[PDB]
Amino acid sequence: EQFHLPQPFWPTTKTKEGEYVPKDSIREASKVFIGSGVLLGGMHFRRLMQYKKGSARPGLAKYLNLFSLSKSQLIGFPVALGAFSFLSHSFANLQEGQTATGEFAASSIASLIGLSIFRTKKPLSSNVAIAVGMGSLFGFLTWAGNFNLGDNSYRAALEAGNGNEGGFDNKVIKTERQGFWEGVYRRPLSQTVEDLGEGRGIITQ
Amino acid sequence: RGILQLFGPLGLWKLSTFISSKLNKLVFLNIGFILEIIVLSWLLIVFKVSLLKYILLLIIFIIL
Amino acid sequence: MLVQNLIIFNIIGIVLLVLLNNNNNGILNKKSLLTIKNELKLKQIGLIISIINILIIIENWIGFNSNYYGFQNIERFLNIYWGIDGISLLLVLLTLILGPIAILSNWKNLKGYYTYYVISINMLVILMALNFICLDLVSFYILFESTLAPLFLLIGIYGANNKNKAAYYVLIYTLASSLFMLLSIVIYYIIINSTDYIYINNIILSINLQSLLFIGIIIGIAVKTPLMPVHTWLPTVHSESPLGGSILLAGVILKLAIYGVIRLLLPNLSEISMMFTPIIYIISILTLIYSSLITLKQTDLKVIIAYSSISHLAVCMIGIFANNLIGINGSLILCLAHGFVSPALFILVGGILYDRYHNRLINYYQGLSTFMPIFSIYLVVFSFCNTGTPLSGNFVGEFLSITGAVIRHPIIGSLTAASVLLSACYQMKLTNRLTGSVFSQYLHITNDVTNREIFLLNWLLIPTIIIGIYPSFVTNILNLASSTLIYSVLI
Amino acid sequence: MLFTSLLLIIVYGSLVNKSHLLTKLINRLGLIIIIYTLLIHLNINTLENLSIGINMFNNLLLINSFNNTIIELILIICILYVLLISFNITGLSIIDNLNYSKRTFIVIVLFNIIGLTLLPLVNDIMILFIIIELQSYSLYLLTAIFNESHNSTKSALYYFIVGSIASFIILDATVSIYDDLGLTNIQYILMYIDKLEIFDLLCLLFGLFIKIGLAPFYSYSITIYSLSPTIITNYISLMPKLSILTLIYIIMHYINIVNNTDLNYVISFLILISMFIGSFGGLNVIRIKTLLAYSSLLNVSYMLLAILSNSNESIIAYIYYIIQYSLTHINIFSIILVISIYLPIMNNMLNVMITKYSPIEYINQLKNLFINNIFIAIALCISIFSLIGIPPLTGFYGKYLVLISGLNNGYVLLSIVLIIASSISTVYYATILKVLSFDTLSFKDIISNNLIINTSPENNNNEIKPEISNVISYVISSLTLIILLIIIQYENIVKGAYLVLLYNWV
Amino acid sequence: MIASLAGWGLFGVTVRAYQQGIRKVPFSYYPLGYVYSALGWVAFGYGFNLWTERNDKLLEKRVEKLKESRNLRLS
Amino acid sequence: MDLILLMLVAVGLNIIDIYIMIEILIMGCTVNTIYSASLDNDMIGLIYSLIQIIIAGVESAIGLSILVNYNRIRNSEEIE
Amino acid sequence: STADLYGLISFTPKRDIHHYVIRVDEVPGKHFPTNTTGNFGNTVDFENLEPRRKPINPYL
């Protein structure tokens, strides 16, 4: 008998057992690592030409210095992004889906791998704190449902008839659990026992 | 006076000072600076949207 | 006949003070007569306004039925429905009572701008009082956060040396957290098309959605009680805000979180409140235990009082989340009792000692009973009231809250009994030091408690003793209203 | 009315002699023109008749109830702006004569009003390009109206280049749509909404996002608003957003027909970044107009969340938010112009230079406003507390309605972020309030005989001479109480927003 | 409707009274200003009431069609 | 080669060079419009092409005038 | 009553590529500036045109 704990999790579309064709972690991660390296490397060489186009104009130099990346950054960034793509896909396959826990782990580990490259002249604990901060942000991103709930939103549920447009009726009791956005007047007592359990006032005193 | 200040007014002030200092250097009148940003935003159209989170991680890396 | 009269009279009262004081501001270089004696005639009018506000709720109290279930005095005003039940009636009376007390506390200890202070105090009292009689979530939130604007300016203008830091703390802590409560309110208006109290109480949402709504609401509540670990703003605000601001904050504002649990969590999120009850107890028990131990190491006189309020309201949160009538009634009794004793401790510390020596460090004070016997009598009596000694309303509230906690959870709810020892540890150590040993070598002999300060202490002590000895004055009103908040299916 | 009266003003201004008095009286003529334009527009255009949508001029323009509301708002806000240049703002010649120096001030405004009103009505890609350039060019001229100012000309040069690039992007998007379909009318294009590249419309929105200072293109907007004169910044930082945001809502309305999820994510990505820069950007700044520029960016992000959702609640949220933000925008800049009379006069450290174009340029120049003018200080405090979102002010209901549309459409991440951004932005909002009042009790017993207002001669020592002119003070008083007392008429105003339909019908 | 226009006239007096404090003049300075201010917002209040009364009629007509649309959805 | 933003090097290091870049960029859209209109045998696209030429000419005049006055301000003492 | 009213208004009907509003009230091509009769590819007869779709006015 597991403990009865609250579940503050937004609705997500679930795939039944046998679904969720796994993602090729190596191929997906290699595309990000190669693509990032070419663009970051390509722009670095292009910015070098801008320096040679003119070096006696302070205005141009000021903006070029901001966009300039160090050699470690030019190496660290593709590796961190490549590691992020691999771990995010690898952890998703293990759980048969993408979760905030896996994204927190994928983001924090990949950031720490990258931080150890271009942030060498810093304490290790300093890089761990940033890696935890970076991983928590992307874990929050997945928990919130990425940029949009999509078909799990109330507007999508309202169009599908899973909303509360028809009102409520206490004389109709549904054995199955209601929708995420659906409200009811009266619920089965068995569902309350499932959510809370017997004990402190449910059924028994 | 410790962890609740790190996760509080004192910690957020240091975080705000670090972030706002970077943003203060990004605001200056320069045609080449703003032109590159506009052209850079064209990559969002080209890139497949599944790469947005990788861009988001890359942006945070440059804040450091 | 309540909200309409209360708002219109106070708005007219605000206009009356503005017209009189600001008439000759046109670079007249004038002297005028209203400003004589530190604007005495303008403070007096504002004090009369606070007294009349009390009479407004008394007229509606005469018609209140304690045997009637549901909201009474239902009224439509500003497209908002207003109503009163047993719980709301008592909290409104406490808020309006502290009106004149807060004004009288800063009668002649402000550097100036008394008219601005008087209007701000009366505005805060009415806004907080209106928050107990609104009948929907949107109206609840509007009044919940409307008090921030007058309070932010009040602390930043009439505050102590660190008033700037205190003003930022109260504005940002109480707004960033209340915005999470607004998200839950917005969700209610999206899926139910209404935020009415009665309408949302009859709707059962999914167990996952109730978890999300509870977390959003509890963040705004937990910061406002306050609970650990989002409590660090309160000691800073009390140690820097003016005495009248401290009285309202300690006596009314912190009670809005307990009332928020009654309206926003128990009757509408009943299923998830049962699940969250062990978590709430763990947080509140640690809040009670940690705050008492932290108070033992504080050196600021007014900060010690600020931490004492945190421990007591932890008991209130424990009692109000008990699923029995004993715990619920005890939490409400303790809120009323805390609404009188806590301001008195600030008056003794921040209004009597501070107004004479202007230093809040504890090292400067000892043996005050030698030349301030009247001060020590009230200090000792209110110290025992704050520690839950019987014959005081705090004991009735604490005992029933502890008893209700044990009934709700016999094992971990028993830990609430540690408040009996821990509260006496920090409160008496302060009182034993302030009265024991020889008179302080750093203090000059001066006046004892004056008549004005005697009046403030006596009329805050009287309600505490009356409630402590005969709490049936309070229980009779609360019994029918509080019985609706219990969720149980006994078969 | 606008076009016909503009030609008369152009000829008349070049005929009469050059003087400050004639220019001011000509400015009042422009005020009458806009007032007459509002009366004519209200006489023929009604909400009920325009609910279906009526085509005009060979279907090149399409007016509906949603479009008509913004046009009425544009005319009204322009009336309040002309009052600044048509009347005294401080009563001092050394300060007020700047507004009366340029005769073409009223002419350029009338040129831009025509562009602003017609932009939401565009129904063809050809007229879309023409009108957007008509509005853009008028803004460049107004930014450069003070051609003797180094900063004004520099800002206009910056404004021209950034806007021209945005216009090229807009033109590039419309041309790409013509290549795919061969049609120029939007309604004809809607027939092929499921067969054209929907990301070409995202290219169109990218050009429009640049013109409203959206991130990552925020940098030029902050720089231009701070360098430009306060009388110019007050117009160019609000008016372009009135029309372009309305057009963006219409374009997003068409985009949502196919409901491209990838399109929403890209716009969500830009909204997320704009909230980060809008909040943290203003934390460490010393200029008031620089602070307001970050405030403008943050509030546009809030409106874009309603626009991105594009539902029935979005119409209510957007219409209310744009109206109340404009009134708050006017109120704040009106107070800033007036309070320049309380600036101390030197009679030095940091060698601070203040010019006649921007007498109020730093946040700390607002010190002791609680003592200098208690009623004006409270009016500013009410406006600032509205931007924060303190209920029951107009600002709270704007954010309350935006959150409703965002959470109803499933934008949980953006709704939580917008509330964290609101708390972060409250820090610099509260700094304005700290400067105004937090030192009142220490400076109450102070002497200030060196203020700018003290240089104004008295009439007879017996006349009660007000410190502020009748018109500008009345506008501040009216706008402040509307923001404060919106709860009285909030229910009816939202009912009016219920009737604003964008092809909803049933 | 007289009570409504009385309230609008009361609002106009408040705006003028608030203007006097902004300009730093006694509240009795030029008492005719209150008459002008009150009648100005009475005219606005008369138009506002017509706007709201007209809006109530339009809302009811649209609600009838919305209920018909909802009935088809709930079937 | 376009994704590395190679065109940012082809633009010279003067303000007027930015103006030339904008004229070329706008001219590319007009050439594309003529290309589509000629294939379709559509005179509507040629109407659009003519409008783009006229509008772009107006843009150049306004930008040059701002740049002319900007250069005038620096050399504006004219004490001689 | 208020909750019922808001539910009706706040409901956004579903739009897709099969059902949406297009504001065109007539078929073009009845008259060209010159050479109206081209390759006779215009098969739309304006003498027997079926009634067009009319916009819905909810307030009428």
Ligand SMILES: CCCCCCCCCCCCCCCCCC(=O)OC[C@H](COP(=O)(O)OCCN)OC(=O)CCCCCCCCCCCCCCCCC
């Ligand atoms: C590879 C191409 C370039 C990358 C793309 C950049 C453009 C898109 C980013 C949008 C924001 C535009 C900001 C302006 C463009 C940045 C230009 C730049 O790279 O300058 C670097 C700047 C200065 O860095 P600095 O270290 O001081 O100087 C280096 C000297 N060696 O460092 C910076 O401070 C720039 C970072 C600005 C802050 C942007 C933060 C955006 C929000 C990120 C967090 C998202 C918020 C929500 C988080 C939770 C989400 C679930």
Ligand SMILES: CCCCCCCCCCCCCCCCCC(=O)OC[C@H](COP(=O)(O)OCCN)OC(=O)CCCCCCCCCCCCCCCCC
């Ligand atoms: C119980 C109540 C709790 C209430 C508060 C809850 C939130 C608590 C937040 C905790 C995290 C912040 C506190 C700790 C940060 C301390 C910052 C700091 O120490 O320095 C800044 C740091 C660089 O370090 P440095 O400048 O060298 O300082 C010396 C350190 N030895 O700079 C850094 O490296 C920071 C990493 C770079 C910046 C990353 C920014 C990305 C976005 C961060 C999240 C922002 C989300 C905003 C959402 C709305 C806007 C979109």
Ligand SMILES: CCCCCCCCCCCC(=O)OC[C@H](COP(=O)(O)OCC[N+](C)(C)C)OC(=O)CCCCCCCCCCC
């Ligand atoms: C219940 C609805 C109430 C709403 C309206 C309240 C009055 C507004 C002020 C107008 C009159 C005025 O500005 O007058 C100023 C008055 C009088 O102070 P004084 O000492 O005479 O002024 C100094 C002049 N001396 C030195 C010559 C004597 O002080 C006030 O500012 C008090 C009221 C405002 C308190 C809260 C401010 C922030 C409000 C934010 C709202 C969300």
Ligand SMILES: CCCCCCCCCCCC(=O)OC[C@H](COP(=O)(O)OCC[N+](C)(C)C)OC(=O)CCCCCCCCCCC
């Ligand atoms: C969910 C529950 C939320 C509870 C509230 C959250 C924390 C509030 C902190 C108070 C800050 C304050 O007061 O701002 C004022 C402080 C001033 O700092 P100071 O005290 O003068 O010391 C520091 C100064 N020094 C070093 C010079 C002595 O500036 C700040 O820190 C600026 C950043 C504040 C951002 C807050 C955003 C919160 C986002 C929402 C939560 C994720």
Ligand SMILES: CCCCCCCCCCCC(=O)OC[C@H](COP(=O)(O)OCC[N+](C)(C)C)OC(=O)CCCCCCCCCCC
């Ligand atoms: C020194 C000064 C400090 C502050 C003092 C404040 C005193 C307030 C004065 C009393 C006012 C009064 O009595 O208002 C009552 C009147 C009459 O209401 P009605 O016609 O029945 O409308 C219905 C009212 N419902 C819905 C509550 C029943 O409403 C008014 O005129 C409203 C004034 C305008 C408020 C601004 C919002 C609307 C803006 C419209 C354009 C966008």
Ligand SMILES: CCCCCCCCCCCC(=O)OC[C@H](COP(=O)(O)OCC[N+](C)(C)C)OC(=O)CCCCCCCCCCC
């Ligand atoms: C039918 C609707 C309109 C109302 C009829 C009156 C129109 C105004 C003409 C009268 C003459 C006049 O305005 O004279 C100018 C006066 C007085 O200004 P002063 O500073 O005392 O001048 C100094 C003169 N000394 C030296 C003699 C003292 O200004 C006012 O009173 C300002 C209020 C303007 C009128 C209210 C407008 C409300 C509009 C808000 C609705 C959206």
